[PDB]
Amino acid sequence: ENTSENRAQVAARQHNRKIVEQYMHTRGEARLKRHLLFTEDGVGGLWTTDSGQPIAIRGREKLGEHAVWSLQCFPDWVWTDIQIFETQDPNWFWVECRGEGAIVFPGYPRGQYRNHFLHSFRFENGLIKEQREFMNPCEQFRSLGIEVPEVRR
């Protein structure tokens, strides 16, 4: 039905999608300004770690600071094979993609990291309130030369 309320939901979804697109395509020195796509108190980070607990970066300015470190850790990172999924919630999107780049972590040899990824993006007032990355940490272990435990099946 073509009502004001359905139009507002569609418009929100359309603006939000453009922001998810911009986010996934941000490369190089532009990564230092990606934090500006977040709400002041927005959160980003990695939900799948070896420890089992998320590594959550809280607040737009914290996200900006961490982006400096990750530009050294992942100096040429690119996302590839990007698929964006809109949902019933105009303020919630999922993304499936791959990613590849050098990995340069303190205390490890320099490596090449490739993985498959799922991302969750929640919006409030047109800016990103929560971004969460999901991946298989065993692939990152391989990239760092960390022996991967194996489950006998």
Ligand X SMILES: O=C(O)c1cc(Br)ccc1N[C@@H]1CCCNC1
Ligand Y SMILES: O=C([O-])c1cc(Br)ccc1N[C@H]1CCCNC1
> Which residues form the interface with ligand Y (CB under 6 A)?
45-46, 55, 69-70, 73, 105, 133, 153
Structure tokens at 103: 């990995």
Regarding 74 and contact with ligand X (CB under 6 A), the answer is yes
The CB-of-50 to ligand X minimum distance in angstroms stands at: 14
The CB-of-125 to ligand X minimum distance in angstroms stands at: 21
Regarding 66 and contact with ligand X (CB under 6 A), the answer is yes
50-77 core/surface letters (b: 16 or more CB in 10 A; e: else): eeeeeeebebbebbbebbeeeeeebeeb
108-119 core/surface letters (b: 16 or more CB in 10 A; e: else): eeeeebebebeb
Regarding 107 and contact with its own copies (CB under 8 A), the answer is yes
The CB-of-139 to its own copies minimum distance in angstroms stands at: 5
Q: Which does 118 bind (CB under 5 to 8 A by kind): ligand Y, ligand X, its own copies, none?
A: its own copies
Out of 94, 100, 121, 122, the residue judged to bind its own copies by CB under 8 A:
94
Nearest to 70 by CA among 25, 28, 125, 19: 28
Residues in the chain: 153
Site of interaction with its own copies (CB under 8 A): 47-52, 55, 69, 85-89, 92, 94, 96, 105-108, 116, 118, 120, 134, 136-142, 144, 146-153
**Residues making contact with ligand X (CB under 6 A):** 31, 57, 63, 66-67, 70, 74, 77, 99, 133
